[PDB]
Amino acid sequence: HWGYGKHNGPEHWHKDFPIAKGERQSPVDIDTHTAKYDPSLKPLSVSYDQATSLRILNNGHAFNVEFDDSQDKAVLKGGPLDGTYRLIQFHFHWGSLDGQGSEHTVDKKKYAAELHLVHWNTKYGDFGKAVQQPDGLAVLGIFLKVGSAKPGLQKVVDVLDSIKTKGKSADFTNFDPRGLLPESLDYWTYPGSLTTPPLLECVTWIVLKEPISVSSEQVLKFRKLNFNGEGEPEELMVDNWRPAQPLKNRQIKASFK
Numbered sequence: 001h002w003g004y005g006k007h008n009g010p011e012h013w014h015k016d017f018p019i020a021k022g023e024r025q026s027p028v029d030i031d032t033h034t035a036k037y038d039p040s041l042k043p044l045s046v047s048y049d050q051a052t053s054l055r056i057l058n059n060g061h062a063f064n065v066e067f068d069d070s071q072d073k074a075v076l077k078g079g080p081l082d083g084t085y086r087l088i089q090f091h092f093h094w095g096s097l098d099g100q101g102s103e104h105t106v107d108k109k110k111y112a113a114e115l116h117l118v119h120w121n122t123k124y125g126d127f128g129k130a131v132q133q134p135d136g137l138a139v140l141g142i143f144l145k146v147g148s149a150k151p152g153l154q155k156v157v158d159v160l161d162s163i164k165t166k167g168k169s170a171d172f173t174n175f176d177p178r179g180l181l182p183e184s185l186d187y188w189t190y191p192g193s194l195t196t197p198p199l200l201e202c203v204t205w206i207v208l209k210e211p212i213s214v215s216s217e218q219v220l221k222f223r224k225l226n227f228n229g230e231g232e233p234e235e236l237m238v239d240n241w242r243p244a245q246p247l248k249n250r251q252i253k254a255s256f257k
């Protein structure tokens with residue numbers, strides 16, 4: 001099956017998921033000189049006060065913090081979006097080295113990691129239906145640079161020892177995802193896809209301009225995770241990012257000047 005290795009990585013995915021060569025694939029490079037300010041874009045509305053985190057899972061590709069999405073508890077609205085999108089999970093993509101790891105790039109710059117807060121459009125009833133729709137998902141992407149620690153990330157960092165290997169999960173209640181946001185909600189937006197198989201073209205991407213900073217010790221602990229299951233050959237979970245894909249017939253819009 002698919003992965004990030006030399007024999008099963010992004011250059012192989014099209015063989016089982018031909019949409020990998022489609023018209024609206026993600027991530028992309030964000031050319032800040034070609035993205036156009038759109039005054040019709042509204043401020044984003046991030047309403048996470050009632051968020052209910054439940055569990056953290058190592059799925060062999062990343063780790064997902066999962067939320068209760070059976071009511072409007074943690075929702076994203078506004079910006080480019082029509083309607084209400086519920087947070088179902090967040091996860092990250094990161095590098096083996098501080099100079100790489102993000103999926104989106106900004107003027108070809110790679111960040112150390114990238115956080116994806118994944119939301120689905122409530123008009124489609126459930127996440128599985130939503131991924132089949134061109135406006136089914138909204139993923140809020142946030143870049144991570146290495147610098148000062150991010151206090152709101154530490155609870156995530158600290159549980160990773162309990163989910164080192166593929167298939168391990170741990171209770172992860174009462175986590176507040178607002179602690180992962182930067183100060184500014186200025187963003188770029190474009191239509192795209194899931195960045196992992198099945199690569200479905202169902203995502204409105206909203207990528208924040210302002211990165212968050214995490215410490216070297218925090219990102220080092222991401223890199224101690226394992227892609228493999230317990231008892232299999234140890235392979236460090238690093239470089240779990242897809243590189244930028246062709247923008248094709250798409251425009252990236254900026255919420256700011």
Ligand SMILES: NS(=O)(=O)c1ccc(NS(=O)(=O)CCNC(=O)Nc2ccccc2)cc1
Nearest residue numbers: 054064066067068069070088089126127128
């Ligand atoms: N019940 S919950 O606690 O709120 C919950 C449940 C699962 C997750 N995991 S996930 O976010 O990675 C989404 C996993 N993908 C699907 O579930 N796909 C799907 C869904 C319906 C039909 C066909 C396919 C997170 C929270």
Ligand SMILES: NS(=O)(=O)c1ccc(NS(=O)(=O)CCNC(=O)Nc2ccccc2)cc1
Nearest residue numbers: 059064089116118139193194195196197203
């Ligand atoms: N990197 S990204 O573009 O933000 C991105 C990439 C993928 C997803 N999909 S996901 O949430 O479901 C996590 C993957 N897990 C499954 O698909 N599980 C599953 C599968 C079949 C049936 C039931 C469950 C979301 C965001």
Ligand SMILES: [Zn+2]
Nearest residue numbers: 091093116195
């Ligand atoms: Zn992702």
